[PDB]
Write a protein that binds this ligand. Structure first.
Ligand SMILES: CC(C)(O)CCC[C@H](CC#CC(O)(C(F)(F)F)C(F)(F)F)[C@H]1CC[C@H]2/C(=C/C=C3C[C@@H](O)C[C@H](O)C3)CCC[C@]12C
Ligand SMILES: CC(C)(O)CCC[C@H](CC#CC(O)(C(F)(F)F)C(F)(F)F)[C@H]1CC[C@H]2/C(=C/C=C3C[C@@H](O)C[C@H](O)C3)CCC[C@]12C
Lengths: 10, 239, 239, 10
């Protein structure tokens, strides 16, 4: 998943 | 005998990236859940680490060639190097004078005891202190400090990396710069680069011990509930 | 015409349970991520709500017959009634004088605008304010306030409940107490009990609107990352 | 799942 990391990596 | 227009460029990007992602005043710290001196320091340090991860991500995204990697890899690298990069960058706040990270007044001066109140053992905190000191004794130029972080992050041997050739390529390119920079800009750097690569190995085991003691926390809800979503995602196993 | 030795007992447990789980000074609030007046209030209010959930759980565990329910149900009830119970208990801190929750100095006085900076619309905040006022105007005895919370929680019609007979039984037993108590201990309570059940219906829609605006947040990581694990677990869909 | 709620419910 990794919803947040994806988001933070623009 | 002389840096190149592309090596100067990489150093310029990295140094800026670090300035852009590391406040030397630590003003954001007030935004964290206050420090309490069981596990009274957990909320604060968890906030501290969650915040740092964000900064580490901001830095990484500016490392040359990093953006071009798959989302999959960028995550694989960030997850596995997360804590190491944090240990490296924290050296700017560490001080030999009192053997602690001094991020502000009495509230933000972090000694080894404080971290004990976060669920970590003095046993595995020693190597950290020892690591910070040796790193501090190297009196790294900003460029080397910044380069060391980027090189650490672009390690090809992390659980999860796919294209470990494109990553190894990027890394030993950075390595060249570090060697080149040290050799022509750092008087007495004859031995430095080796000493710096030593640190990376130190970081691996330092990373290892942490990942263990963290699993403990992450399994006890009364403690895991004290963490942040970002932390839980980064130090989690769910890939 | 006279309370029974078992109805007195239930009232005694409930009133104590509430005292045990609701600080009238709000001293713990300093422990929260500081308030900032986008979504500057999200971290604080999320901390506030996460904290409250814990208190609400502590209260529930002392509600008679609640412990005897399956872990499955206790969770089903807590998840679905969570926000409602919080809205009910917050009435002690709400005040008509300035139409806000006053939990302390300038920092902890929560007005409708503050909650806007948490991702909620003034549109769906109105019914909350209106709800608090009407509840406040009822001048509930502690017993009724406490009973209303326990009755709200033991609602049988929640998504997830299994043994909705044992739950309906517990609830309308509590209801009896409330009616009985009001009728013999509250002068002028002729109409009160009906008015109180009105509130529960109000709470349902108040709950509904929130669960919607919360899904928005929970889907945007830049925002969901600001929440706490407990909140994410309680207002999550993962059953 | 609900690791935390379980825990908190003693
Ligand atoms: C014993 C050892 C090495 O295994 C612990 C390593 C991690 C430990 C903190 C933690 C943790 C968690 O396991 C988390 F999950 F990871 F959260 C927690 F236990 F859950 F909390 C160390 C690493 C670097 C240290 C510090 C860096 C200071 C900085 C200040 C400033 O320089 C900014 C820097 O980025 C960072 C000071 C505090 C103690 C820190 C943060
Ligand atoms: C508009 C409406 C009704 O749909 C919002 C309802 C929830 C909203 C806050 C929120 C939220 C979140 O959706 C969370 F996910 F739920 F977190 C968040 F947006 F993510 F943050 C309301 C409900 C009760 C209100 C308050 C209670 C005060 C208390 C103080 C004291 O009396 C102690 C009480 O327990 C509680 C004051 C602040 C605003 C509150 C907490």
């Amino acid at each position: 998943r990794h919803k947040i990391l994806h988001r933070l990596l623009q | 005998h002389m840096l190149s227009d592309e090596q100067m460029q990489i150093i310029n990007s990295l140094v800026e990236a670090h300035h852009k992602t590391y406040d030397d005043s630590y003003s954001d710290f007030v935004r964290f859940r206050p420090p309490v001196r069981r596990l009274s320091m957990l909320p604060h340090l968890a906030d501290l680490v969650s915040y740092s991860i964000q900064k580490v991500i901001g830095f990484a995204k500016m490392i040359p060639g990093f953006r071009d990697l798959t989302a999959e890899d960028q995550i694989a690298l960030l997850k596995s190097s997360a804590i190491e990069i944090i240990m490296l960058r924290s050296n700017q706040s560490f001080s030999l004078e009192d053997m602690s990270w001094s991020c502000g007044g009495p509230d933000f001066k972090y000694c080894i005891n404080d971290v004990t109140k976060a669920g970590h053992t003095l046993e595995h905190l020693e190597p950290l202190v020892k690591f910070q000191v040796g790193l501090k004794k190297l009196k790294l130029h900003e460029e080397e400090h910044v380069l060391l972080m980027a090189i650490c992050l672009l390690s090809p041997d992390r659980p999860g990396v796919q294209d470990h050739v494109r990553i190894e390529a990027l890394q030993d390119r950075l390595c060249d710069v570090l060697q080149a920079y040290i050799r022509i800009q750092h008087p007495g750097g004859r031995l430095l680069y080796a000493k710096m690569i030593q640190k990376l190995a130190d970081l691996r085991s330092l990373n290892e011990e942490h990942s263990k003691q963290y699993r403990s926390l992450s399994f006890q809800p009364e403690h895991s509930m004290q963490l942040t979503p970002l932390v839980l995602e980064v130090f989690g196993s769910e890939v």
